[PDB]
Amino acid sequence: MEEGGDFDNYYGADNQSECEYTDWKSSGALIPAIYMLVFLLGTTGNGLVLWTVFRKKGHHHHHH
């Protein structure tokens, strides 16, 4: 009878990385990786950094 199978584990899937089970059924887990590469490029530490700089050494100590 056909129950059990014979040699059916052809290796190859060299990834099993914890970086897809999150964006699986979403966009193929290939578009999000790019969406960020273009996001953090503007955020994270770009434009918002030098901003806090010219926001702390302002004037303050104003009269009172």
Coordinates of N, CA and C in Angstrom, one line a residue:
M1 N 0.9 -1.2 0.0 CA 0.0 0.0 0.0 C 0.9 1.2 0.0
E2 N 0.3 2.4 -0.4 CA 1.1 3.6 -0.5 C 0.8 4.4 0.8
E3 N 1.6 4.2 1.8 CA 1.5 4.9 3.1 C 2.8 5.0 3.8
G4 N 3.4 6.1 3.8 CA 4.7 6.3 4.4 C 5.7 7.1 3.5
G5 N 5.8 6.8 2.3 CA 6.7 7.4 1.3 C 8.1 6.9 1.4
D6 N 8.9 7.3 0.5 CA 10.3 6.9 0.5 C 11.2 8.0 0.0
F7 N 12.2 8.4 0.9 CA 13.1 9.5 0.6 C 12.4 10.6 0.0
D8 N 11.9 11.6 0.8 CA 11.2 12.7 0.3 C 11.6 14.0 1.1
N9 N 12.9 14.2 1.2 CA 13.4 15.4 2.0 C 14.5 16.1 1.2
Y10 N 14.4 16.3 -0.1 CA 15.4 16.9 -0.9 C 15.8 18.3 -0.3
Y11 N 16.9 18.3 0.4 CA 17.3 19.6 1.0 C 17.5 20.6 -0.1
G12 N 17.7 21.9 0.4 CA 17.9 23.0 -0.6 C 17.4 24.3 0.1
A13 N 16.4 24.2 0.9 CA 15.9 25.4 1.6 C 16.9 26.0 2.5
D14 N 17.9 26.7 2.0 CA 19.0 27.2 2.8 C 18.6 28.7 3.2
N15 N 17.7 28.8 4.2 CA 17.3 30.1 4.7 C 16.8 30.0 6.1
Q16 N 15.6 29.4 6.3 CA 15.0 29.2 7.6 C 15.3 30.3 8.5
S17 N 15.3 31.6 8.0 CA 15.7 32.7 8.9 C 14.4 33.4 9.4
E18 N 14.5 33.9 10.6 CA 13.4 34.6 11.2 C 13.2 36.0 10.7
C19 N 13.0 36.1 9.4 CA 12.8 37.4 8.7 C 11.9 37.3 7.6
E20 N 10.8 36.6 7.8 CA 9.8 36.4 6.7 C 8.4 36.0 7.3
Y21 N 8.5 35.2 8.4 CA 7.3 34.7 9.0 C 6.4 35.9 9.5
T22 N 7.0 37.1 9.3 CA 6.2 38.3 9.8 C 5.6 39.0 8.6
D23 N 6.3 39.0 7.5 CA 5.8 39.6 6.2 C 5.4 38.6 5.2
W24 N 5.1 37.3 5.7 CA 4.8 36.2 4.8 C 3.6 36.7 3.9
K25 N 2.4 36.2 4.2 CA 1.2 36.6 3.4 C 0.9 38.1 3.5
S26 N 1.8 38.9 3.0 CA 1.6 40.3 3.1 C 2.0 41.0 1.7
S27 N 3.2 40.7 1.3 CA 3.7 41.3 0.0 C 4.8 40.4 -0.6
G28 N 4.9 39.1 -0.1 CA 5.9 38.2 -0.6 C 7.2 38.4 0.2
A29 N 7.1 39.2 1.2 CA 8.3 39.4 2.1 C 9.5 39.8 1.2
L30 N 9.3 40.6 0.2 CA 10.3 41.1 -0.6 C 10.2 42.6 -0.9
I31 N 9.0 43.1 -0.8 CA 8.8 44.5 -1.0 C 9.0 45.3 0.3
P32 N 8.7 44.8 1.4 CA 8.9 45.5 2.7 C 10.3 45.8 3.0
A33 N 11.2 44.8 2.6 CA 12.6 45.0 2.8 C 13.1 46.2 2.1
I34 N 12.5 46.6 1.0 CA 12.9 47.8 0.2 C 12.2 49.0 0.8
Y35 N 10.9 48.9 1.2 CA 10.2 50.0 1.7 C 10.9 50.6 2.9
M36 N 11.6 49.8 3.7 CA 12.4 50.3 4.8 C 13.7 50.9 4.4
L37 N 14.4 50.2 3.5 CA 15.6 50.7 3.0 C 15.5 52.2 2.5
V38 N 14.2 52.5 2.1 CA 14.0 53.9 1.6 C 13.3 54.7 2.7
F39 N 13.0 54.1 3.8 CA 12.4 54.8 5.0 C 13.5 55.2 5.9
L40 N 14.1 54.3 6.6 CA 15.1 54.6 7.6 C 16.2 55.6 6.9
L41 N 16.2 55.6 5.6 CA 17.2 56.4 4.9 C 16.8 57.9 5.2
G42 N 15.6 58.2 5.4 CA 15.1 59.5 5.7 C 14.9 59.7 7.2
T43 N 14.5 58.7 7.9 CA 14.3 58.7 9.3 C 15.5 58.2 10.1
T44 N 15.1 57.4 11.2 CA 16.2 56.8 12.0 C 17.1 57.9 12.5
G45 N 18.1 58.3 11.7 CA 19.0 59.3 12.1 C 19.4 60.2 10.9
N46 N 18.4 60.8 10.2 CA 18.7 61.6 9.1 C 17.6 62.8 9.0
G47 N 18.1 64.0 9.2 CA 17.2 65.1 9.2 C 16.6 65.4 10.6
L48 N 16.3 64.3 11.3 CA 15.7 64.5 12.6 C 16.8 64.6 13.7
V49 N 18.0 64.2 13.3 CA 19.2 64.3 14.2 C 19.6 65.8 14.4
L50 N 20.3 66.3 13.4 CA 20.7 67.7 13.4 C 19.6 68.6 13.9
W51 N 18.4 68.1 13.8 CA 17.2 68.9 14.2 C 17.2 69.2 15.7
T52 N 17.4 68.1 16.5 CA 17.4 68.2 18.0 C 18.6 69.0 18.4
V53 N 19.6 69.1 17.6 CA 20.8 69.9 17.9 C 20.5 71.4 17.9
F54 N 19.9 71.9 16.8 CA 19.5 73.3 16.7 C 18.2 73.6 17.5
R55 N 17.9 72.7 18.4 CA 16.6 72.8 19.2 C 17.0 72.9 20.7
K56 N 18.2 72.5 21.1 CA 18.6 72.5 22.5 C 19.5 73.7 22.8
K57 N 20.4 74.0 21.8 CA 21.3 75.1 22.0 C 20.6 76.4 21.5
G58 N 19.3 76.5 21.6 CA 18.6 77.7 21.1 C 18.9 78.9 22.0
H59 N 17.9 79.6 22.4 CA 18.1 80.9 23.2 C 17.9 80.6 24.6
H60 N 16.7 80.1 25.0 CA 16.3 79.8 26.4 C 16.9 80.9 27.3
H61 N 17.0 80.6 28.6 CA 17.5 81.5 29.6 C 16.9 82.9 29.3
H62 N 15.8 82.9 28.6 CA 15.1 84.2 28.3 C 14.8 85.0 29.6
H63 N 14.5 86.3 29.5 CA 14.2 87.1 30.6 C 13.1 86.5 31.4
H64 N 12.9 87.0 32.6 CA 11.8 86.6 33.5 C 11.6 87.4 34.7

